[PDB]
């Protein structure tokens, strides 16, 4: 039995309703009991059981979580959603062997827009000694996740050798952070002087520009 979960991701404001569906392949209800279970998983942590047998709340789980459905259609409702609810939610059936899991539904929390805090860092002398040159820009604690980061060397834009990395939504403040790394050889790095990372984000009409000179 395969379980399909929709949607792939959900964006919800604090206090609002989150609705998650799990579609089976066959009935999983014994006319009375339904063999459906729900889990919550936060990054770096094991899944946590929320609901067992379609509708029963596990001890120590808040009543904000409600499970429902029968036959082939099963629903998890989170009402109201709180900031600690940012997680991936899984359904799972215990109808035949093996028990199988849905693919998961990512729940992100909506919050007020926040501008990034931008910092730029030259390569360390220890990295330069070993032959490489990574220039690093951190863009921290922003919302929404959508952001544009461009690198300029000596005033002109650059593209090759840039690598970006995003954190998961922070469970405390619902913001995102990202790292942007410009990788170069020492030779390339030494034969240029100014280095700039420019963040465009919906929170300001003017971009955030951080720079340093190799002197």
């Amino acid at each position: 039995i395969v379980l399909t979960q929709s949607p792939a991701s959900l964006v919800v404001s604090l206090g609002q309703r989150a609705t998650i569906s799990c579609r089976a392949s066959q009935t999983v209800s014994t006319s009375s009991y339904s063999y459906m279970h729900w889990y919550q998983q936060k990054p770096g942590q094991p899944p946590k059981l929320l609901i067992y047998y379609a509708s029963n709340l596990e001890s120590g789980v808040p009543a904000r979580f409600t499970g429902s459905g029968s036959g082939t259609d099963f629903t998890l409702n989170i009402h109201p959603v709180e900031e600690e609810d940012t997680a991936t939610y899984y359904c799972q059936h215990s109808w035949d062997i093996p028990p199988t899991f849905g693919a998961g539904t990512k729940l992100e929390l909506r919050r007020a827009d926040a501008a990034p805090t931008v910092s730029i860092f030259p390569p360390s002398s220890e990295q330069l000694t070993s032959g490489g040159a990574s220039v690093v820009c951190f863009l921290n604690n922003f919302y929404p996740k959508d952001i544009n980061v461009k690198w300029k060397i000596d005033g002109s834009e650059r593209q090759n050798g840039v690598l970006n990395s995003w954190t998961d939504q922070d469970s405390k403040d619902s913001t995102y952070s990202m790292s942007s790394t410009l990788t170069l050889t020492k030779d390339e790095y030494e034969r240029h002087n100014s280095y700039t990372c420019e963040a465009t984000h919906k929170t300001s009409t003017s971009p955030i520009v951080k720079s340093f000179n190799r002197n």
């Binding site: 094991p46 910092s119 860092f121 990295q127 990395s165 790394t181």
Partner: protein
């Protein structure tokens, strides 16, 4: 409370065998009709149930695994084991032991998980570069393998590791008030247990 702690070789070469242990504390694995399952999670977060052993030593497997996995127990050590041979890179995952819910076939108490990487690549310790200019500081951690680094600072973001020609890179930042640093000392301690290495890089102005 009841705690389950998994352990086992993090890096195993392909073809060979993975052997994991789950030590339970706070309840006996022979008590009161409970069942104990092994569950793995692949990169990309798919979950796969592997099998269970009951309090009375009954074992049932996932039929797609029965040919190459064995689940056993040592009740005198309150331990459960998972053995799996004929390994491919498809077996790289986080492996969990779980106590099943009282009515069975759902998973109520989970262990912290232990990651197994199936690869032929050598173990390589990280190089740690300080990132120095409120004030934001950081450390870049480059060229290590396998994945499993933790950074701690003496307000923190840990960015996920990126693979690049066999070696991982990640970075971590910390923010402190501009009176605090460089007056006080800030140090990023980076641990890489696969190489038994720790790097304590102090941030210098």
């Amino acid at each position: 409370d009841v705690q389950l702690q998994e352990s086992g070789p993090g890096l195993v070469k392909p073809s060979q065998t993975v052997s994991l242990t789950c030590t339970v504390t706070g309840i006996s694995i022979t008590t009161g009709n409970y069942r104990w399952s092994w569950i793995r999670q692949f990169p990309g977060n798919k979950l796969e149930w592997m099998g269970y052993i009951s309090y009375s030593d009954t074992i049932t497997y996932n039929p797609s695994l029965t040919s190459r996995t064995t689940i056993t127990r040592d009740i005198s050590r309150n331990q459960i084991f998972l053995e799996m041979n004929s390994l491919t890179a498809e077996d790289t995952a986080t492996y969990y032991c779980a106590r099943e819910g009282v009515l069975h076939w759902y998973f109520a108490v989970w262990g912290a998980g232990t990651t197994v990487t199936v690869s032929s690549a050598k173990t390589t310790p990280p190089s740690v570069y300080p990132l120095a200019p409120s004030v934001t500081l950081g450390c870049l951690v480059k060229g290590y393998f396998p994945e499993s680094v933790t950074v701690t600072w003496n307000s923190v973001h840990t960015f996920p590791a990126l693979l690049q020609s066999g070696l991982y890179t990640m970075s971590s930042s910390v923010t402190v008030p501009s009176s605090t640093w460089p007056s006080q000392t800030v140090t990023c301690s980076v641990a890489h247990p696969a190489s038994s290495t720790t790097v304590d890089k102090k941030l210098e102005p």
